[PDB]
Amino acid sequence: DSSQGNSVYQIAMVHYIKQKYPHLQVIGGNVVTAAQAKNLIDAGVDGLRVGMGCGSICITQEVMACGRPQGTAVYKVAEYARRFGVPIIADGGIQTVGHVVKALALGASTVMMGSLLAATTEAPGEYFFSDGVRLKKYRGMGSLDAMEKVKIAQGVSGSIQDKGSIQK
Amino acid sequence: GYVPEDGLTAQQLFASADGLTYNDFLILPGFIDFIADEVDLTSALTRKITLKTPLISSPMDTVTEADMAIAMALMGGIGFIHHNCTPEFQANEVRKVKKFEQGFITDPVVLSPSHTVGDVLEAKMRHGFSGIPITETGTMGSKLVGIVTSRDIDFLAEKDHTTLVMTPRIELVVAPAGVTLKEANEILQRSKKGKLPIVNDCDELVAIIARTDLKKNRDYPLASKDSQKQLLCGAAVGTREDDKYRLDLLTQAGVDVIVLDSSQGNSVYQIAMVHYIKQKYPHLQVIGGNVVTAAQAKNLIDAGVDGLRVGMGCGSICITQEVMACGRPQGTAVYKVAEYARRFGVPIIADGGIQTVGHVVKALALGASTVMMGSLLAATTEAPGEYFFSDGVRLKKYRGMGSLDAMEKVKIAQGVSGSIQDKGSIQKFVPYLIAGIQHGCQDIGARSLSVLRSMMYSGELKFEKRTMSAQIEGGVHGLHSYTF
Amino acid sequence: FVPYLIAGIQHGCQDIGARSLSVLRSMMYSGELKFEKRTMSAQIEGGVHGLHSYTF
Amino acid sequence: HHNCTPEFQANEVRKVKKFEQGFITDPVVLSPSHTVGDVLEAKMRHGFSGIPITETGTMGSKLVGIVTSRDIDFLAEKDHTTLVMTPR
Ligand SMILES: NC(=O)c1ccc[n+]([C@@H]2O[C@H](COP(=O)([O-])OP(=O)(O)OC[C@H]3O[C@@H](n4cnc5c(N)ncnc54)[C@H](O)[C@@H]3O)[C@@H](O)[C@H]2O)c1
Ligand SMILES: NC(=O)c1ccc[n+]([C@@H]2O[C@H](COP(=O)([O-])OP(=O)(O)OC[C@H]3O[C@@H](n4cnc5c(N)ncnc54)[C@H](O)[C@@H]3O)[C@@H](O)[C@H]2O)c1
Ligand SMILES: Nc1ncnc2c1ncn2[C@@H]1O[C@H](COP(=O)(O)OP(=O)(O)OP(=O)(O)O)[C@@H](O)[C@H]1O
Ligand SMILES: Nc1ncnc2c1ncn2[C@@H]1O[C@H](COP(=O)(O)OP(=O)(O)OP(=O)(O)O)[C@@H](O)[C@H]1O
Ligand SMILES: Nc1ncnc2c1ncn2[C@@H]1O[C@H](COP(=O)(O)OP(=O)(O)OP(=O)(O)O)[C@@H](O)[C@H]1O
Ligand SMILES: Nc1ncnc2c1ncn2[C@@H]1O[C@H](COP(=O)(O)OP(=O)(O)OP(=O)(O)O)[C@@H](O)[C@H]1O
Ligand SMILES: O=c1[nH]cnc2c1ncn2[C@@H]1O[C@H](COP(=O)(O)O)[C@@H](O)[C@H]1O
Ligand SMILES: O=c1[nH]cnc2c1ncn2[C@@H]1O[C@H](COP(=O)(O)O)[C@@H](O)[C@H]1O
């Protein structure tokens, strides 16, 4: 789990996992370009997580000017990964059903949803009321509220309206 | 080795001839082989002057006087003293920077034995402090004869207005000639006093340390100092014959660098002024501008300037494009002018439009050697003017130099006056900028700003345009109500 | 109001580099006058931005 | 008032009945066996530094000296010595 998965740190960690626990499957990431993907695929990952700054809560592009528009990223990384039989996960930016069908049509094998599955009965934490409606807290893992457990805010903390149950 | 090609080079990004600004593109991430703290921000300001950080305070009357310039120098950068003020005022602001030292008092209040205690109270009421030394004449160049403080005043009723109460020279603890702050710390620890006067071998008063200032001493490793270990100061100057007088006073005040200040720096007036400076003060470094195209840059670089200020109408307050239809989008301008200037070794300053940290990293990746800010560095503790409340929030005035409220002291208004929210102190906020610039360089894969520009020019740094939709998604979206 | 217009037109021609409106058109037709498109973003930045509450 | 314990109310009365103008009421005091850290503890909990020192640590033994913010203010957090005291 990183914002920029093309590091020496992640490649070291992937080699460590594949040499200590060879039964375990490793998804690296996040990557947005094919060169990052190439480094991680040589490191021996079994899948890739694709996305950088498309998240509903993310502000990474505004503070470090780094990322890629998500349709382009999914297409390019998935096209490169397919030459090796590696599936990719289109992670971030999903808000509708059309976004899921679009991401799957561009080559993503699976779709990772944070905000779209948040504020469900199964989501962590507890509901609260504001303005006569049920809300649940939703936050970035590099928001100042999450990373408290000089630091730069990569993400935001906020609210999502109640949704129901995952099984419905 | 094989690296798959993905993205545009900076030359291909700017080859479609759209008017791109900072928000129209993103930098693609690279390979990380180092920690964010290892990123070197060393930066050429001119052909000869190097800063340890790319950040500059704009020469605006609501941004840069001596306190902003001192804070910018101490944090790693530089400030340019504005010129919407008399020639003697501006030279006095430069002198305050050039004669600053940490922990030592600058321009001390001093009195004669013939003053009354009522003058010590008056100095307290106007300046906010009471620990005033006494000297045989009246100020900073004669025998230290004693000290007076608020504890020498306390139990005098206003019935008593006696002449200087004074603890005499025989009683005092003093430093002998010139001290590192460690000998000052060891004296003020062992003496329990609130002031340490510094004298000469002939016992003139030459400086003071306050205990309050010495307790607030800190490391400034990026101090941005000249060869005689004094802080660097710049100053702004116009291109009229009246400016030849400022240029002498600012030279006498010890200014390190001049920025010639215009909206369109490719004039006969500015070229004349640059030739005048380089022929009268050949030790002085001159930044011309503002320019947005390479032809302007060529004229100024033949005129002999040492740096270029790049920007026209991107400023937060500027309305120059709406009234004269002249300018350029700032990303394009920075790229083109910097590409031309690099053929001659001239650094450029990406001036205007900066609002975020991504804008700083984007401007540096496009070839700018330093970034100049008005609005980001405005409304701070060190910014000129004073605050004022409105609807329950501390706001400070921020006027562009070509606004009718700036040119008061038929004219076409090219600027706008406005207000910013309170921000804090330069010594707390410039580290946030430095930390974000270093993390952005680490995500890009550059271990220094020099290597960043070298990767951009060789096509290793890749880019990516953004539609409107991609700028929307790159923000915050989908949330019911978020908070920063 | 017309003098304000005339003064702004004259200052714009002076920033462009044309000593008359005839010379302006002559520079445009011969390719000496150069231009530059603007994205939406560049039109936004060419306005007033970032301030809390400005005034004209 | 009496919406408080009997001992709290008697302590509020005793504060009034033992007040005197200009003199300090219920002074903070320390022993020579306290650390300089206890002066900092007394500060950020009460708001003052000028704390006298005595053999029993309160209002009832030889005044052995005083400790004050200018006795503390050039120590780093590296130093937590026992009581820097200006002596009797
Ligand atoms: N949209 C995104 O892709 C995105 C953007 C920002 C943050 N995040 C999320 O925020 C959370 C925090 O991750 P992160 O993005 O801060 O990256 P991270 O926590 O992996 O790394 C943060 C910093 O620590 C450094 N680091 C990591 N391992 C190191 C090691 N062994 N030695 C030295 N330095 C090391 C990195 O180089 C980087 O400077 C994660 O949940 C991540 O997914 C995601
Ligand atoms: N960079 C920008 O986008 C921008 C835009 C507008 C204004 N400004 C700022 O406004 C302030 C005022 O400068 P300015 O832009 O009005 O340009 P300026 O003050 O240099 O010149 C204003 C006018 O006087 C003329 N002039 C200058 N020197 C002259 C001389 N010696 N003899 C005759 N005429 C002369 C110019 O040609 C122009 O018509 C500066 O701080 C400037 O940076 C900046
Ligand atoms: N004589 C002086 N001339 C100029 N600045 C001074 C002078 N004395 C104090 N200052 C400055 O004023 C600020 C407060 O200083 P200090 O704490 O020593 O106040 P003081 O002189 O003892 O006044 P007061 O009795 O009101 O507390 C410090 O930044 C200090 O450097
Ligand atoms: N360097 C010194 N050498 C000797 N005596 C000094 C010196 N500096 C100050 N004094 C004297 O010590 C006494 C206290 O002054 P000091 O500056 O130390 O505290 P102060 O700022 O007046 O105290 P306070 O903060 O309570 O108002 C005064 O009588 C003053 O004249
Ligand atoms: N030892 C103490 N015990 C109780 N009250 C005290 C004590 N010392 C000071 N005070 C009270 O605290 C208030 C501030 O006192 P003073 O100006 O002397 O502060 P101080 O002791 O010098 O602390 P500081 O170093 O923060 O200035 C006064 O009302 C005073 O009576
Ligand atoms: N009654 C006293 N007799 C002798 N020395 C004292 C006495 N009261 C305080 N001191 C000593 O004098 C020095 C200054 O203490 P003082 O209370 O006057 O100032 P402070 O509270 O430490 O500093 P400041 O008032 O500037 O905040 C300290 O070293 C202290 O121990
Ligand atoms: O604080 C954060 N900053 C940056 N990205 C985050 C943060 N927390 C989570 N993310 C990313 O956001 C994705 C979810 O996107 P979302 O469903 O659009 O909200 C996650 O899978 C992460 O890649
Ligand atoms: O009133 C004005 N009109 C036009 N441009 C100005 C004015 N005042 C300052 N500038 C420019 O705006 C820059 C600051 O841009 P900002 O930080 O985005 O507000 C300065 O360095 C100048 O180049």
From Swiss-Prot, chain C:
Tissue distribution is: IMP type I is the main species in normal leukocytes and type II predominates over type I in the tumor.
**Positions bound to K(+):** E45, G46, G47
Subunit structure comment from the entry = Homotetramer.
Q: Which disease is given in the protein's UniProt record? A: Retinitis pigmentosa 10: A retinal dystrophy belonging to the group of pigmentary retinopathies. Retinitis pigmentosa is characterized by retinal pigment deposits visible on fundus examination and primary loss of rod photoreceptor cells followed by secondary loss of cone photoreceptors. Patients typically have night vision blindness and loss of midperipheral visual field. As their condition progresses, they lose their far peripheral visual field and eventually central vision as well.
Designated name of the protein = Inosine-5'-monophosphate dehydrogenase 1
Task: State the protein's purpose.
Answer: Catalyzes the conversion of inosine 5'-phosphate (IMP) to xanthosine 5'-phosphate (XMP), the first committed and rate-limiting step in the de novo synthesis of guanine nucleotides, and therefore plays an important role in the regulation of cell growth. Could also have a single-stranded nucleic acid-binding activity and could play a role in RNA and/or DNA metabolism. It may also have a role in the development of malignancy and the growth progression of some tumors.
**Factors inducing expression:** Constitutively expressed.
Q: Identify its protein family.
A: Belongs to the IMPDH/GMPR family.
Task: Please tell me what else the database record remarks about this protein.
Answer: Because IMPDH activity is tightly linked with cell proliferation, it has been recognized as a target for cancer and viral chemotherapy and as a target for immunosuppressive drugs. The activities of the antitumor drug tiazofurin, the antiviral drug ribavirin, and the immunosuppressive drugs mizoribine and mycophenolic acid (MPA) are attributed to the inhibition of IMPDH. In addition, bacterial and parasitic IMPDH's differ significantly from mammalian enzymes, which makes it a suitable target for anti-infective drugs.
Q: Which locations, inside or outside the cell, does it occupy?
A: Cytoplasm; Nucleus
